[PDB]
């Protein structure tokens, strides 16, 4: 809904402390390659792998986004504010965005 010359988003990295809650936001730049030539391939453990290490599965051309580490969402100073002042925390809701996409 923009076209070639209009940005589809802005960079929001800040953290916000309302004191009952904290809202942390992270914006990053990513690069997505073509994985295994647009192909679904089955993968499995080789011969000579021990019984414990055998596996069977599928690799896909798709990539995925993982924010599941804390330091993604918290700076070391924001982490300090949390751990020094608080007896506990839990996540409430999240919001995710992809924007300013470029295919080269």
């Amino acid at each position: 809904a923009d076209g070639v010359g209009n940005s589809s988003g802005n960079w929001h990295c800040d953290s916000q402390w309302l004191g009952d809650r904290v809202i942390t936001t992270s914006t990053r730049t990513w690069a997505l390659p073509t994985y295994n030539n647009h192909l679904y391939k089955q993968i499995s453990s080789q011969s000579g792998a021990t019984n414990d290490n055998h596996y069977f599965g599928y690799s896909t051309p798709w990539g995925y986004f993982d924010f599941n580490r804390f330091h993604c969402h918290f700076s070391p100073r924001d982490w300090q504010r949390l751990i020094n002042n608080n007896w506990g925390f839990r996540p409430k809701r999240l919001n995710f965005k992809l924007f300013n996409i470029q295919v080269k």
Binding site: S75, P76, R77, W79, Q80, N84
Partner: protein, 103 residues
């Protein structure tokens, strides 16, 4: 210059004394002042409540900041605590300047 806030109208002085209670006067009038008083003292309870306004830290620095912390190493006495004899002590002169700000 020792520190604190300068006030033109600081908190007022609260003054207290025990009212004199005379001992038994002579039975004939004497205009001399009484030097003879019933020995007494007073005890009681005193409450002080101050409301303090705070200025929160807005800093954007990435790295952590110096905090005032207790030491985790074991010790005979806990700091800022009574001893075995019931004596409260303060180990160090804690100051108020830890968080940082740009000029």
């Amino acid at each position: 210059l020792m520190g604190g806030f300068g006030l033109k109208h600081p908190p007022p002085q609260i003054m207290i004394k025990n009212t004199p209670v005379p001992a038994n006067p002579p039975t004939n009038f004497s205009a001399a002042k009484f030097a003879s008083f019933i020995t007494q003292y007073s005890t009681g309870q005193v409450s002080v409540e101050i409301e303090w306004e705070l200025q929160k830290e807005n800093s954007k620095r990435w790295n952590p900041e110096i905090q005032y912390t207790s030491n985790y190493n074991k010790s005979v006495n806990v700091d800022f605590t009574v001893d075995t004899n019931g004596v409260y002590s303060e180990p160090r002169p804690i100051g108020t300047r830890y968080l940082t700000r740009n000029l």
